[PDB]
Write a protein that binds this DNA or RNA. Sequence first.
DNA 1: GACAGAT
Lengths: 612, 161
Amino acid sequence: VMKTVLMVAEMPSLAQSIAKILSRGSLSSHKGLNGACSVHEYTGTFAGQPVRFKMTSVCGHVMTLDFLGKYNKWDKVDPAELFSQAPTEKKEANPKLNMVKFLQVEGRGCDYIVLWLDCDKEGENICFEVLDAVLPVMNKAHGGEKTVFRARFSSITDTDICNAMACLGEPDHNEALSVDARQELDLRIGCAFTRFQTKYFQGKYGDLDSSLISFGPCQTPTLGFCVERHDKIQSFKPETYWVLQAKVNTDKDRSLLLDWDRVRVFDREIAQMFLNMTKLEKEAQVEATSRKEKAKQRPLALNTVEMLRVASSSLGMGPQHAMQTAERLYTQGYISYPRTETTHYPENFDLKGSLRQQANHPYWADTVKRLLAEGINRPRKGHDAGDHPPITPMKSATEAELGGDAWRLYEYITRHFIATVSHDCKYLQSTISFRIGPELFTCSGKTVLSPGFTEVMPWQSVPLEESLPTCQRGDAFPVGEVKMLEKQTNPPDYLTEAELITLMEKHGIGTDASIPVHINNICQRNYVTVESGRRLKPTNLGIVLVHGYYKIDAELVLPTIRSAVEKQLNLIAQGKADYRQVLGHTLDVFKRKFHYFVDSIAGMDELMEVSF
Amino acid sequence: MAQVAGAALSQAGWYLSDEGIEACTSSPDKVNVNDIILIALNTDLRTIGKKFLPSDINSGKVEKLEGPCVLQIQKIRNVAAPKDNEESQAAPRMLRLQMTDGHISCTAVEFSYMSKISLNTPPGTKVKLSGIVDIKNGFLLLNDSNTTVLGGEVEHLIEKW
DNA sequence: GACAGAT
Ligand SMILES: [Mn+2]
Ligand SMILES: [Mn+2]
């Protein structure tokens, strides 16, 4: 008398890791009838009975949502029909992977399910997508029982996985309903607006032929960020301001450049009087001296957003290229899961052993050996979103083993990892305040007492400056020259990819796995152009769209509707609001905006005539 | 015939012409220096006050302003901030106060620091200069030790910004 | 013929 228990993970890597951990090492692995997901079998104990365990893995979302027939046709239905009278069905993503039939055939004779999927919102939706395919295949329950299970986990360590297996719960249907409502709203709104815009601007302007003009809850605000930066750049008037600076010539060999306490003035005559009552002086007196000690704080654990920003800024890769390189490294086993929002190391994470692997590399051999011999530092405590542990290296790599572009990403990840474990940067901040007549000046220096994480990340260092001369109150130093400088305020530059990710993260536009895509889509639709310094410059098509939306209905570009709709959808997850009611109301609200958009489309057409 | 109103003014500032003082008296009963001061506070100075500040005060050839004098603020601008981000904290606040009496204008600069005068101080607010004030390059150097914000309430075109 | 977002 034996029973079979089926566990399903969200990815083959997690499936294999969890099988290896839970089996103590007994597993037999054989590929299934898909060529991409394997089955690991072993024998153990469940619910006080001996059971045979089968671990398998889905590959992301099993199903997506698409319209039925005669409605996917572009020229057969009015886009306004894609709100209420357009049936939607869940079809298979990656139909090459059979997925549904694979789960159905591996769930025959199963008596329990332990869903080991990701512990995020989309994880529960994938759990129910697995359940509606495996549940009608398993054996019938008897006397109640708890056949469906859910394991809550974030770390993939032995202790964490054992605790997760000991503490098993139930899946949440409300989160799945919330995700389904989000998918439905997004599909309907995007399809309707994109179809209308593409069909309108292609039959009127010959330049936009075979050009896709897409609207979405994320693409439009992402483009609006760049267009708003462009508006700041264009509507900028340089202003002239004067800065008064003086030089003091102690010990006949140096010349300290003093800074003016009142940083700037915007009045020529005021600057003139300030210079007038200062220039005809030859003795500068000392009024203050500071020797305050300060610390530069070590980085938090690496997440996908920070990795993308540093890749765009320093390394020089687009978000999509960085994500692809990180995915290849993760597949080959060099780094962990590359799509994380977590900046907090798990308590049971093995920092010391992972840092031990990177001891033979010539670049950072000395630092790692010093860290292990003289004790390591506790990493900072950050956000602990329960989806995935932060991006950390787990294999020693060399420039020969890796490529010319994966090595640069790997080098930063491993350099970041040592910095988090390393100490802080302690530096002195000397300041001397001078009285030249009625007016004051300061001279600020900086010297490094003990570099910490700086020696692993030399770019995040303290620049070397010569130590300011020793001097106390009452010391008088001859002053060489004081001169007024004329300066003008500089206009801001176009949004960089690093800056856009911060604004996308702040306003909740896109996810950890969708931020690279949304930036790439608006580049492919010729909305923005990538320029020097990874700057995103809006095109003529990008300006007319965002400007036209402001004229017609601002509620389509502001980066607050996405958070507002999500907050309404969050009520489904908490059980306060019904699923049908929120979906019906939100679609109805957007339906009348579409009709306003269609009947007031002359706003965009006015701005399109000038360019195309 | 006892113009104790003018007598008290000649000792406590408030240079006001005959027309101004007769127009700031709310009753033909007797001298009420307190309520004349109150009405002057509630009234614009440009139409009632006499002329006190020396001519060519906005240029050189003058070094000191002597005596206690009440003057009306007409405009206030933060010189150490751009016209766009007027509340920027990238530089210490410095205020360029356009100040006047009934006839002649002058400009003052916040030298040390004045918490009493702010960027939102309403135009028409009145300030008393006490002691000897230093005029450098035509600018009155104003600090907290020679500036008394008497306060006032006169019509606000600033509300329309 | 295409679409949305997200994994
Ligand atoms: Mn996931
Ligand atoms: Mn996520």
